[PDB]
Amino acid sequence: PGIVELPTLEDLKVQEVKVSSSVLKAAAHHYGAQCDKPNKEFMLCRWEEKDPRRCLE
């Protein structure tokens, strides 16, 4: 029943972090400890909205 709204490919284009797993895991503790507030904002938005398209920004 009706169209399912999907975000366009334009705003979807986002700089993707171009690093491997080892580099991520090696600095994961410091990465999580320092830059964490934007992660928490997105983490809360994903569990509260329950809709991925709402928190893409």
Partner: protein, 63 residues
């Protein structure tokens, strides 16, 4: 004894029988509608209670 005993006793018996007969006839109508639309006290078939649901946050955020 006097005929007033039999007369008054019987008409009271007829009154009791009428209410008994009327209630049974109404009963088939009440029970019929209950089993059809089911918004009454009895005939309520069991349903899963809304208390078993785990509303705590899950591993997958969208669920």
């Amino acid at each position: 004894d006097g005929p007033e005993k039999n007369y008054e006793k019987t008409m009271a018996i007829l009154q009791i029988e009428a209410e008994k007969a009327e209630l049974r006839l109404k009963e088939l109508e009440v029970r019929r509608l209950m089993r059809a639309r089911g918004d009454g006290p009895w005939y309520q078939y069991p349903t899963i209670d809304k208390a078993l649901i785990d509303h705590s946050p899950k591993t997958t955020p969208d669920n």
